[PDB]
Structures are given as structure tokens and as C-alpha cells.
Amino acid sequence: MQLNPESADLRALAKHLYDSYIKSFPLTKAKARAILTGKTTDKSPFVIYDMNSLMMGEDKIKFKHITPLQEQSKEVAIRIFQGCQFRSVEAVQEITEYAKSIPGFVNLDLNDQVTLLKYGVHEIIYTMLASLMNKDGVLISEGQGFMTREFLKSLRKPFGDFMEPKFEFAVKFNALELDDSDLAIFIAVIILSGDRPGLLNVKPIEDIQDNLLQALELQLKLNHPESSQLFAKLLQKMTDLRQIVTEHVQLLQVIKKTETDMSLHPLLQEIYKDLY
């Protein structure tokens, strides 16, 4: 590895991506981890860890003696997915803003820009979701709440199975200790994916992605002396992010053919809307 015009160009691109990442994403990983590790002394989320803590606060004591509504699994799942999609609007807008700062992206056919983002955002939302997760739980209600992993896992099927594979992913992804500067390039690589269905012009997307991959390679070597195959491990995380998205799409096919009746407390329905 040498310091040469090619390396300096790849560093200039990493710095450009980091600067537009900071402008695009007000909730950075650093800010997420500071909330999860106590540091933000004025940002102290309430922990929801059981049915009692779910219904603490005057606001919520009134669902303690409400009588559980029977509904189809199907209808409860779809209402949750309608809500978390609606609540993703800021993330989608921020990712779109970020994509426009990737050199070459706004020169692509505008329909290809829409295709890259309408598939890419879901993998980047799960990347952001990892930032909100530790082994114990996940930040909810714009960082004011913390829903426990084991409480989510305890809920009746299929809901109790929705989040555990995202936790399994997050604790392993988070163990790589990427920072915001690593993530800026990671996310750019995901967005400039030449394999998205329905792309008109694949080659110019692959040309930008090849340059982003070289910038990621150099970034990880300079930023992570402790992990010599971090680049290969991150390329495998990109596969894992696609598999989680595919699992959502498949589960939705499966739930849509079920006619199971069940209840889910309205306050648990509300919390699932903050997830993905």
C-alpha cells in the first residue's frame, strides 16, 4: 500500500461522503451509542421490559383494564407494517439527500435513481436500526424509549419472531465497531447496487460502485488496524441485510394466507411501528 494520487483521490471521496453523511443524518451512530451507553446525561430513555412497565405513566394506565380485541394476525401485522413504513419517511428522505451527494449518482437516469433508492433504503434502514440496538434492546419513540429484546421475543407468534433475527444481526454487525466514517462508504456501496431489478443502465452504476468499493477497502485498512479481513466481513453483512429484507417480503406472503385470530396489546402495536 502506497500514498499516491489514486489513494489521495479515494481519501478525498471518503471525506466528501463523511461530510454529506453528517449533513444528511442528524442521528449518527455516535449519537445513538452515546444514548445506549448512558453518556447523553440529558437523554435518559424509559425502559419497557414487561407488561407493567408497558402501562406505566398516566397516559397508559387506561389500557391495564381494557379487554383484549380478537383480530386476524394478518390485519395486526399489516397495520404495524403500514405504520413503520410511514414512520420511515424521514430516513428515506435523508437517504435520498445522501445519495444525491454520491459523485455520479445524479447523472444516472432519474428512473434508475428511484429504483436504486426504493430497493436500497430497506437495507440502510436495517443498518440504522443496528445503531439503535444493543444485546438488551432497541431505542424507540425518537430515543425517549428502550424496548427490551427478551420482551419482544416473549410475545405470541408470529410477532415474537419479528425482531430476534435483527438483534442477532445487530450484535454481530455492532461487534465490528464501524464508525460513522466507515458507515458513510458502506451505505454508498449498498445504494450503488447494479443488481437491483428493473435497472436501465447497469454499467455506470457498477463503475461508481467499483470506486466506492476501493474507497471502503482503503477506509477499513486505515481505520481498523485490529481486523485484517474487515472488508470481506462487511461484504457478507451486505448479503445479511438483503436476506433480512427478503425474510420480511416472504413472511408477508405467508401471513397473508393465514386466518389466525389473536390479540396484541395496542401499546405493543405502537412500539412495533417504531421498528422495521
Partner: peptide, 21 residues
């Protein structure tokens, strides 16, 4: 379009002015 909601948000953000796209 089964994804017209998501596509619209992306399109408005790409084109610049929410109210015109």
C-alpha cells in the same frame, strides 16, 4: 404501483420541491 407511496417520497426528495412532483 404497489410501491407508489415509497416511490413518491423518493421522487419528491430527488426533484427538490415536495408540492410539484
Amino acid at each position: 404501483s404497489t410501491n407508489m407511496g415509497l416511490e413518491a417520497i423518493i421522487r419528491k426528495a430527488l426533484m427538490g420541491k415536495y408540492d410539484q412532483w
